[PDB]
């Protein structure tokens, strides 16, 4: 079992359902949450951020693509395209905005938001897909400076991100986590 | 039991309460969900669409007529008429709009929305009853181009409709379903 | 047990919690729901109408006085007066409007709303207390034509009132109920 | 166990979860709710007021600092500061307003709101932290006359405060409670 | 809706799940619980008796055949036969005794248990199927005087049966019910 | 509200459902739990003892008569008599023993069990009804020295009775309670 | 998604938690429940049989090894060995009998129980591990003719096994399933 | 917060309610679960063992003293003494056996059960109090070789104890824990 203590923190810090979705996502890609425990903390973080993001705005505003199984996520991605007319993205996005009619790619990075946004923008060729990056320091960067949600909703996500960083720094796990991305 | 596999898909694809309401509705009209399984999938679909439709808008906006028993649905249809003054419709409608003061007939078709709207409009003589048609392809057609709900609420219904079509096409049940209406 | 069948209808027509509150209210005033079964149906009706009324509007808009015990209802009536400055009403009202700063007396009558409003207005001397009457036929009458809630919220109450009347007429209990007020 | 009857009233008057949070807060500071029962009633009162306060406004508007453990409350206080840029307060505040970008110190006093606000303002050196005082008589005083929430939300808190006072006066516990602050 | 008051008593006297199973059983056989209300009370009674019967004895002692759908009940009846070797009964029984290896036919009659047992024994040709009759007066008659369960379990069923009779006699519905079998 | 502190202890010491049943029982007999608070503690105590008593023994062993409404309790008392043949008791008993075929009168006294048993035996003329007395000191006395349940079940009731006495002595309410029977 | 209809039957026939445990077990071994759907039905069947098996007997009789994750199942297998002294089995067993002090290997086969027992006995070298085989036809074979549980508990498992076979035969999936082991 | 990783393991290994009871027990004695984390794991372990111990045997067999607050635990200890006649123990015990009429002191040690039993027996002067020691290795020692419960119930406790030891050894926390008692 290796007994990694980053693993015990992830199970105590995150929601049991978020932990289970992160485990299924990693195992589907041939990754062990017990071995690649720094990632394990990252999919949980990215998953939670995606969920609070969809919690912002109206009730029927967002369609959640992240967290589903690969086949089901691509099925919903299709149905959105064949009903609105948006182009099918090359890579699986995180959300869909029914209010702005675009897919959203949510990013959570340990470095400056400038580089990660560049890597995210260079990966996707469909420039229509909206990009929204968050950082553990409290920064954010969105496409065309369009941050989609309200300031209070984005502030809650930043607060949670910094709380996670503090809890890992208290357990001396932050240095390894930052130097793993 | 015939062992129809359209039946197993309906039970796995739809909500248990929606399946139970569709079964009671079919049996009340002398129809077997185990035999007329293409219909069985259609009442479930029509039922779900009616429910998400009422989920759009405000909390007290819609009165749900579809899904009730025949006697109870006609009792509520009455009470709405004897309190607002709207004319009693000849056939049982699906919803009532407290905001626009009209009954809504929700349609879900496998062909072009043009024909089905014509059949729905020719059936009812009370032209006051509002008609709103949806299609599995992603089209919609409403009376006087008044689509009642927001675009995001209607888009969610279209996305779900196309997801159902994909799941049946994956199980090779879509061709029989489309050629049954 | 007398075996009155109006009693069985009240238990089947109304919510179990509403039935229990009506029973405690009647017993507190020395009345048997098993004997005075026409009243029993009326306190349940009045109770439900009061509850849907408070369900209209915003979340913190209304304070519910009806349904509480006599001592507790007068305690809350006080606290509202000693904090807002409104005069203490002589008789226990049903609600309090934090938005309009007034107590509301809800009426549900079997005759024309004109007479019942007159009896309700002649009873209270505090003309500041707002009066809102409903009828089983679908009429309503409020003080200064100020109906407080939205039209859709009031329409839902009227629809429910007429549904109750129909269910009793089907059981031949409506004639006795109307001739009891 | 001393058998103080102020203790039994607190357990009957307040929510079980609010009582448990008040007990943990007192024990953390080396105080016995069974001995210092007048305080015990006050932390419960202050806790409830803080909770209804956060219930006002939008869903993601307030971050709740009061009620958490000391280390966790300071962790969230940090994360809010390192993400918004607000100065770290010297003493632990009660809430944080994501809408106005400020910490809120909620006060509940048994005397005139004028003195308590002065003591609260003299304690904190960070004049940016917003102060909102409530009284058991129905008064309130906020920094710069900015009362943050709606009138109806604040009125509900005042009504509850006066209800608590009445319930203690009925049990002859109000005189000791007022002369303990 | 006919407004039969036997119907309202059945809905108030019996469990909501038992009422729903009785309604599905009657509708499956082309019977209206709103019209044939004396039967409606009888399937509910027979259903409840069958359920308390299986509640007697050990946990895994009885397999419940009554209450299931016709196809599913015959499927379980088969599986019991193809695993134990018991002969397939001609008519659907109520229970199966894993302890005594026999099917049980439960009877609830309004006349003397002697006649009903004779009619039940003449109907089935498989003399291996055990017969257990109950009466509303407090009598019981079982095959070979083998009453299967304990005396206390059977006494509880008799007590409930007489309670149902009293509740109907109080509502003047007992005379019609007894003269309907 | 009188603000009696025996009342607050009863609400904190006993189960919410037991408190509600005791309140309905007292109000049915024209007694105020807020005024006759020493009784209020006694019906709760007697009610709880009756419930733990039925919790002893097998699952279907006891029929609970105490706690029901007067008409319903007499209905069940009848059905037990018309099915087993036991004589109808003159006064309402507490339980019925399906194992020993007798009604049980449970007593909870503040004096010696000798006197209370004599008063209980002189009240009832049906000597068949079993009598079982408990005391707050830890004594018990049953008819024909037949204590019905196991020693461990009766010991749990005695322990609970002495715990209640201690909690009242700590609040200085025991002296008034003992001198009220 | 392949749209296999054996998959839809497994999801409708088995418990949602049993389906989830079977999916995790297959994915852990690099198997797709959507592709190897005949297996998918078998792990669900084997899982359910293991669960009903542990449901037989006393409450603390069995320790469940099957269904856990590989590392956790081996951890519990150890703790049982290091506390009772039983030899560590070479392969992961299904249960442990605290009453007989032995591990149990549960088998569910589509052929005669004779061959499968031979394959199961030849696989394990620890002859101390008890073997209990079940068949879809209604047969069973246990080590030393020691069938561990009662006849009624084993009969329930056989009945369920034959019910599963019938449901697949009705959907024409039984022939492929039997010819896959 | 110190960020001790023994703390994270305790929160992941033990039940949330057991963790909360251990935290209240430590804080009551002036101990920090965040600092004295080796103890923190021990009170959780001792608490769980006490709970499974009471889960063995009949339903009303054991009275649970451990886990309660100090005043309440001594209140129940009294009531047991003043009703059965057993002598009041000098130190708070863990359980009470209604079947054997004695208090039980449960021990969980990291060394040989011989020494710990001696320390436990030398501490208490009331030789009537029964002593039952468990070890993380799988040993147990009880007074007069009377192990109270069944072998299967005690074996489950031993298995759980060894599982806890393995989980800590995997996280390299076992060496510090054993060298802390
Ligand atoms: C729908 C359901 C799960 C949703 C995920 C998401 C979780 C949501 C839960 C809410 C309640 N809150 C808020 C407070 C705590 C809590 O619990 N939040 C948001 C914050 C963290 C969290 O947990 N939502 C949104 C709709 C309801 C729901 O639960 N998902 C998973 C991926 C796709 C999807 O829509 N589904 C769908 C099928 C499988 C499944 O599980
Ligand atoms: C009221 C009740 C049933 C309602 C039908 C409808 C179902 C609603 C459930 C909601 C919650 N969501 C949303 C997320 C999943 C879920 O579950 N949605 C909407 C989406 C699909 C669905 O299921 N609604 C609306 C009010 C509450 C409720 O449940 N119906 C049935 C016909 C009449 C009616 O009003 N009733 C009334 C008596 C019998 C009964 O069952
Ligand atoms: C607060 C609680 C009871 C409330 C009465 C009222 C009932 C409300 C329930 C809601 C949910 N809906 C809506 C759908 C069905 C349902 O159930 N509605 C409204 C419609 C009918 C109904 O039932 N509300 C409002 C707040 C939450 C709640 O339940 N009351 C009783 C008198 C005072 C009061 O505030 N209280 C308070 C202490 C005792 C008690 O019971
Ligand atoms: C989040 C949770 C507790 C929250 C405290 C607060 C309590 C809230 C409960 C709501 C529901 N209502 C309203 C009706 C009755 C009720 O119950 N209200 C408000 C009124 C009184 C009350 O009780 N809220 C707000 C979010 C959901 C929730 O419960 N707290 C405690 C301190 C930090 C915090 O956010 N947490 C967080 C982890 C530990 C815990 O317990
Ligand atoms: C299994 C389930 C329903 C069972 C019927 C039966 C009902 C049982 C409920 C128990 C709990 N008690 C007792 C106190 C009140 C209550 O509620 N009792 C017995 C007394 C009246 C009653 O209601 N049982 C037994 C197992 C669990 C359960 O519920 N049935 C229905 C027919 C087949 C069957 O096994 N099933 C199975 C699939 C559909 C469904 O609904
Ligand atoms: C049946 C139901 C109430 C029962 C009373 C009785 C209460 C029982 C509850 C159990 C669970 N435990 C035990 C742990 C805590 C708890 O809660 N115990 C026993 C100890 C104290 C207590 O509370 N029982 C027994 C059957 C299930 C049930 O609840 N009563 C009330 C009078 C008649 C009757 O049978 N009924 C029936 C209709 C109205 C109602 O409420
Ligand atoms: C403990 C828990 C799951 C258990 C598996 C097992 C399931 C049990 C559920 C019971 C209730 N019934 C019976 C009626 C329907 C139902 O639901 N049955 C038995 C029949 C089918 C079924 O489902 N049991 C037994 C203890 C309680 C429980 O649930 N398992 C899974 C593997 C290890 C284990 O002990 N655990 C443990 C941690 C993860 C998890 O999930
Ligand atoms: C009564 C209640 C708590 C009890 C403690 C104990 C916990 C019990 C829970 C059971 C269910 N299981 C078993 C499976 C998982 C689970 O959860 N087990 C046993 C194993 C671990 C566990 O958790 N029991 C026994 C009665 C019901 C109950 O819960 N306690 C705490 C100290 C005194 C006491 O009696 N009380 C009483 C008032 C405060 C409180 O909390
Ligand atoms: C090693 O590869 C994987 C991928 C997944 C899901 C991929 N699908 C996404 O959509 C995805 N992944 C990531 C991401 C991460 F969460 C951790 C590390 C690196 C990443 F790129 N960030 C996103 O923002 C995102 O949208 C799960 C497990 N392992
Ligand atoms: C075979 O007849 C039936 C009818 C009902 C309910 C009828 N009442 C409606 O209200 C209704 N029916 C249908 C509909 C359908 F769902 C499937 C096929 C054909 C249809 F017309 N579409 C609607 O939109 C609608 O409102 C149930 C079972 N069988
Ligand atoms: C016989 O007297 C009573 C009174 C109460 C509550 C009185 N308090 C009110 O507040 C109240 N009562 C009534 C009302 C009614 F519900 C039925 C008949 C006559 C009425 F006036 N209508 C209201 O609108 C109202 O507000 C309960 C039982 N019996
Ligand atoms: C004796 O000291 C303590 C302090 C705490 C929490 C302190 N932290 C706060 O934040 C806090 N305390 C108080 C407060 C009170 F609730 C009662 C008496 C005096 C007070 F100042 N009023 C607030 O408004 C507030 O924000 C808990 C127990 N004992
Ligand atoms: C009109 O025919 C039906 C039959 C059923 C179920 C038949 N299957 C049984 O198994 C069954 N029926 C009856 C029974 C009854 F419940 C009421 C009247 C007459 C009866 F014979 N008594 C039993 O004991 C029994 O086992 C449902 C509706 N209508
Ligand atoms: C003032 O009269 C009442 C009577 C009832 C219920 C009567 N029915 C019983 O069955 C009953 N009553 C009492 C009892 C008591 F609980 C308190 C004081 C005196 C008593 F005799 N002890 C029993 O043991 C018992 O069985 C409720 C309220 N007030
Ligand atoms: C540092 O002192 C404490 C004591 C308590 C509860 C004492 N009451 C008992 O009853 C108790 N304590 C312990 C025990 C332990 F769990 C850990 C270390 C040493 C111990 F002796 N083992 C038992 O078996 C037992 O019955 C809580 C916190 N700190
Ligand atoms: Mn993604
Ligand atoms: Mn992303
Ligand atoms: Mn319709
Ligand atoms: Mn329609
Ligand atoms: Mn009123
Ligand atoms: Mn009114
Ligand atoms: Mn504070
Ligand atoms: Mn404050
Ligand atoms: Mn039958
Ligand atoms: Mn009694
Ligand atoms: Mn196996
Ligand atoms: Mn202890
Ligand atoms: Mn101990």
Structure tokens at C18: 């509403």
- Is G28 close to A27, i.e. CB distance below 8 A? yes
Q: Which of H142, H155, A1, H172 is nearest to G81 (CA)?
A: H155
H-helix or E-strand spanning residue C26: helix C16-28
Q: Are strands G130-135 and C62-64 parallel, antiparallel or unpaired?
A: unpaired
As beta bridge partners, residue E44 has none
Structure tokens at D152: 């109806």
Alpha carbons A52 and D98: distance in angstroms, whole number: 15
On whether any CB of chain D is under 8 Å from the CB of H150, the answer is no
Whose CA is closest to atom 29 on ligand 13?
A: E26
Task: Catalogue the long-range contacts made by A177-181 (C-beta closer than 8 Å, 24 or more residues apart).
Answer: A177/A6, A177/A38, A177/A41, A177/A42, A177/A110, A178/A110, A178/A136, A180/A38, A180/A39, A180/A110, A181/A42, A181/A109, A181/A110, A181/A111
Tokens 């005189």 sit on residue: D175
Residue G132 carries which DSSP code? E
Q: Which residues contact H101 (CB under 8 A, 6 or more apart)?
A: H84, H86
Q: Which residues contact G57 (CB under 8 A, 6 or more apart)?
A: G99, G148, G149, G150, G153
CB H102 within 8 A of CB H130: yes
Question: What is the maximal distance between C-alpha atoms in chain A?
Answer: 49
Compute φ and ψ for B125, nearest 5 degrees. -95, -25
Residue E151: CA count within 13 A, CB half-sphere: 7
Q: Which of G42, G41, G62 is nearest to G52 (CA)?
A: G62
Alpha carbons D117 and D96: distance in angstroms, whole number: 18
Q: From the CB coordinates, do chains D and C have 3 or more pairs under 8 Å?
A: yes
How much distance in Å is there from the Cα of C41 to the middle of ligand 25?
Answer: 35
**DSSP states of B102-121:** EEEEEEEESS-HHHHHHHHH
Radius of gyration of chain A (CA): 16
* C66 carries a ligand binding annotation: yes
**DSSP states of B5-59:** HHHHHHHHHS-HHHHHHHHHHHHHTT--TTTSHHHHHHHHHHHHHHHHHHHSS-T
> CA-CA distances (angstroms) from residue G41 to B7, B99, F58, G5, G36?
18, 51, 40, 11, 9
Nearest residue on chain D to C63, judged by CA atoms? Answer: D156
Q: Which residues in chain F have their CB less than 8 angstroms from residue C28's CB? A: 27
Task: Catalogue the long-range contacts made by H57-62 (C-beta closer than 8 Å, 24 or more residues apart).
Answer: H57/H99, H57/H148, H57/H149, H57/H150, H57/H153, H58/F152, H58/H99, H60/F55, H60/F56, H60/F150, H60/F152, H60/F153, H60/F156, H60/H98, H61/F152, H61/H97, H61/H98, H61/H99, H62/H95, H62/H96, H62/H97, H62/H98, H62/H104
Q: Which of B75, E42, E48 is nearest to C13 (CA)?
A: B75
Helix ranges restricted to H, chain G:
5-13, 16-28, 37-55, 70-84, 113-123, 151-170, 174-178
Nearest to F80 among E137, E151, E159 (CB): E159
> Which of the residues D34, D39, D99, D120 is marked catalytic?
D120
Give the ligand with the smallest distance to the CA of G104: 26
Pocket residues: Cβ below 6 A from ligand 3: C 15, 17, 51-52, 55, 64, 67-68
Alpha carbons F21 and F4: distance in angstroms, whole number: 20
Q: Which residues in chain H have their CB less than 8 angstroms from residue A169's CB? A: 3
On whether any CB of chain C is under 8 Å from the CB of D137, the answer is yes
Pick the atom of ligand 13 nearest to E120's CA: 24
H-helix or E-strand spanning residue C135: strand C130-135
On whether any CB of chain G is under 8 Å from the CB of B12, the answer is yes
Q: Which residues contact D101 (CB under 8 A, 6 or more apart)?
A: D84, D86
Q: Which residues in chain H have their CB less than 8 angstroms from residue F167's CB? A: 75
CB atoms within 10 A of CB C122: 8
Compute φ and ψ for B62, nearest 5 degrees. -115, 140
Q: Is H120 in the pocket of ligand 15 (CB under 6 A)?
A: no
CB E79 within 8 A of CB E64: no
Radius of gyration of chain F (CA): 16
CB E57 within 8 A of CB G150: no
Structure tokens at F123: 């009240």
Pick the atom of ligand 12 nearest to D25's CA: 27
Structure tokens at E123: 């109907």
**DSSP states of chain E:** -TT-HHHHHHHHHS-HHHHHHHHHHHHHTT--TTTSHHHHHHHHHHHHHHHHHHHSS-TTSEEE-TTS-HHHHHHHHHHHHHHH-PPPPSS--SEEETTTTEEEEEEEESS-HHHHHHHHHHH---TTSEEEEEETTS-EEEGGG---S-HHHHHHHHHHHHHHHHHHHHTT-HHHHHTT-
Q: Which residues contact F100 (CB under 8 A, 6 or more apart)?
A: F130, F146, F148
Whose CA is closest to atom 8 on ligand 9?
A: A92
Tokens 């009125």 sit on residue: D155
CB A60 within 8 A of CB B143: no
Q: Which of E84, E127, E85 is nearest to E105 (CA)?
A: E127
Q: Which residues in chain C have their CB less than 8 angstroms from residue E169's CB? A: 3
Tokens 């009888």 sit on residue: E42
Residue A144 carries which DSSP code? G
Question: What is the maximal distance between C-alpha atoms in chain G?
Answer: 49
Compute φ and ψ for G104, nearest 5 degrees. -115, 130
Residue G61 carries which DSSP code? S
A107: left (phi > 0), else alpha (psi -120 to 50), else beta? beta
Pocket residues: Cβ below 6 A from ligand 13: E 25-26, 29, 31, 39, 42-43, 46, 66, 92, 94, 105-107
CB atoms within 10 A of CB E30: 7
CA distance A88 to chain G (A): 19
Radius of gyration of chain G (CA): 16
The b-or-e profile of H2-26 (16+ CB within 10 A means b, else e) is ebbbbbbbbbebbeeebbebbbbbb
CB B105 within 8 A of CB B141: no
Alpha carbons F16 and F22: distance in angstroms, whole number: 10
- Cα-based angle C84, C89, C95 (whole degrees, multiple of 5): 70
Alpha carbons C94 and C76: distance in angstroms, whole number: 11
Active site residues of A: 120
H-helix or E-strand spanning residue F50: helix F37-55
| Nominal resolution (angstroms) | 2.4
CA distance G94 to chain A (A): 21
CB atoms within 10 A of CB C158: 22
- Is G171 close to B12, i.e. CB distance below 8 A? no
Q: How many residues in chain H? A: 181
CB D23 within 8 A of CB D33: yes
Q: Which of B68, B58, B128 is nearest to B94 (CA)?
A: B68
* G105 carries a ligand binding annotation: yes
Among B1, B7, B17, the strongest candidate for a mutation testing the E interface, having the largest count of E CBs within 10 A, is B1
Alpha carbons F10 and F35: distance in angstroms, whole number: 13
Alpha carbons H101 and H130: distance in angstroms, whole number: 10
Q: Is D64 in the pocket of ligand 4 (CB under 6 A)?
A: yes
CB G107 within 8 A of CB G116: yes
Alpha carbons D180 and D40: distance in angstroms, whole number: 12
Structure tokens at F153: 């079940």
- Report the side by side order of strands in the sheet with A140-142: A62-64, A95-97, A102-109, A130-135, A140-142
Ligand 1, residues A21, A25, A47, A51: which to mutate, most atoms within 8 A of Cβ? A51
Pick the atom of ligand 7 nearest to G66's CA: 32
H-helix or E-strand spanning residue C64: strand C62-64
> Which of the residues G24, G27, G120, G144 is marked catalytic?
G120
Instruction: Please give the torsion angle defined by the CA atoms of residues D70, D75, D77 and D83, in that order, rounded to the nearest 10 degrees.
Output: 180
Q: Which residues in chain B have their CB less than 8 angstroms from residue G171's CB? A: 3-5, 8
Alpha carbons F93 and D152: distance in angstroms, whole number: 53
Residue G50 carries which DSSP code? H
CB C138 within 8 A of CB C161: yes
The b-or-e profile of G82-98 (16+ CB within 10 A means b, else e) is bbbebeebeeebbbbbb
Helix ranges restricted to H, D36-108:
37-55, 70-84
- Cα-based angle D141, D160, A152 (whole degrees, multiple of 5): 60
Give the ligand with the smallest distance to the CA of H70: 15
Nearest to E1 among B28, B34, B71 (CB): B71
Structure tokens at E7: 């119907």
Structure tokens at H157: 């406790």
- Report the side by side order of strands in the sheet with C140-142: C62-64, C95-97, C102-109, C130-135, C140-142
Residue B78: CA count within 13 A, CB half-sphere: 14
> Which of the residues H24, H59, H120, H144 is marked catalytic?
H120
Q: Are strands D62-64 and C140-142 parallel, antiparallel or unpaired?
A: unpaired
Pick the atom of ligand 13 nearest to E47's CA: 16
On whether any CB of chain C is under 8 Å from the CB of B60, the answer is yes
- Report the side by side order of strands in the sheet with F95-97: F62-64, F95-97, F102-109, F130-135, F140-142
* B106 carries a ligand binding annotation: yes
Q: Which of G22, G52, G50 is nearest to G37 (CA)?
A: G22
As beta bridge partners, residue C131 has C105
CB atoms within 10 A of CB H86: 17
Q: Is D14 in the pocket of ligand 4 (CB under 6 A)?
A: no
Helix ranges restricted to H, chain A:
5-13, 16-28, 37-55, 70-84, 113-123, 151-170, 174-178
> Which of the residues C24, C59, C90, C120 is marked catalytic?
C120
> CA-CA distances (angstroms) from residue H161 to D109, F26, H132?
52, 52, 15
> CA-CA distances (angstroms) from residue E34 to B30, B69, D108, E5, E11?
17, 12, 60, 10, 11
H-helix or E-strand spanning residue F55: helix F37-55
- Is C138 close to B58, i.e. CB distance below 8 A? no
Residue C90 among the catalytic residues: no
H-helix or E-strand spanning residue C62: strand C62-64
Neighbours, chain G (3 or more CB pairs < 8 A): A, B, E, H
CB H50 within 8 A of CB H134: no
CB atoms within 10 A of CB G38: 18
Alpha carbons H120 and H106: distance in angstroms, whole number: 9
As beta bridge partners, residue E57 has none
D140: left (phi > 0), else alpha (psi -120 to 50), else beta? beta
* C46 carries a ligand binding annotation: yes
CB C99 within 8 A of CB C109: no
Q: Are strands C140-142 and E130-135 parallel, antiparallel or unpaired?
A: unpaired
* D48 carries a ligand binding annotation: no
Among E58, E151, E162, E174, the strongest candidate for a mutation testing the F interface, having the largest count of F CBs within 10 A, is E162
Q: Is D67 in the pocket of ligand 4 (CB under 6 A)?
A: yes
Among C2, C7, C11, C24, the strongest candidate for a mutation testing the F interface, having the largest count of F CBs within 10 A, is C24
Structure tokens at A30: 């041939």
Q: Is F53 in the pocket of ligand 6 (CB under 6 A)?
A: no
CB C49 within 8 A of CB C161: yes
On whether any CB of chain C is under 8 Å from the CB of E11, the answer is yes
- Is E11 close to C12, i.e. CB distance below 8 A? yes
Report the first-to-last Cα separation within chain D, whole angstroms. Answer: 24
Ligand 15, residues H43, H130, H181: which to mutate, most atoms within 8 A of Cβ? H43
Report the first-to-last Cα separation within chain E, whole angstroms. Answer: 24
């Amino acid at each position: 079992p290796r007994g990694s203590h980053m693993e015990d923190f992830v199970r105590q810090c995150f929601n049991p359902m978020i932990v289970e979705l992160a485990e299924k996502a990693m195992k589907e890609y041939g990754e062990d949450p017990k071995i690649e425990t720094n990632k394990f903390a990252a999919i949980c973080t990215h998953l939670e951020v995606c969920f609070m993001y969809s919690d912002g705005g109206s009730k029927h505003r967002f369609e959640i693509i992240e967290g589903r199984d690969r086949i089901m996520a691509w099925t919903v991605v299709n149905s959105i395209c064949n009903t609105t007319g948006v182009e099918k993205p090359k890579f699986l996005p995180d959300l869909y905005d029914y209010k702005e009619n675009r897919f959203i790619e949510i990013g959570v990075t340990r470095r400056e938001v400038h580089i990660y946004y560049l890597e995210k923008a260079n990966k996707i060729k469909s420039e229509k897909t909206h990009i929204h990056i968050f950082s553990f320091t409290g920064e954010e960067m969105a496409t065309k400076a369009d941050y989609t949600l309200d300031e209070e909703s984005r502030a809650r996500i930043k607060t949670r991100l910094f709380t996670i960083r503090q809890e890992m720094a208290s357990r001396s796990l932050w240095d390894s986590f930052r130097q793993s991305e």
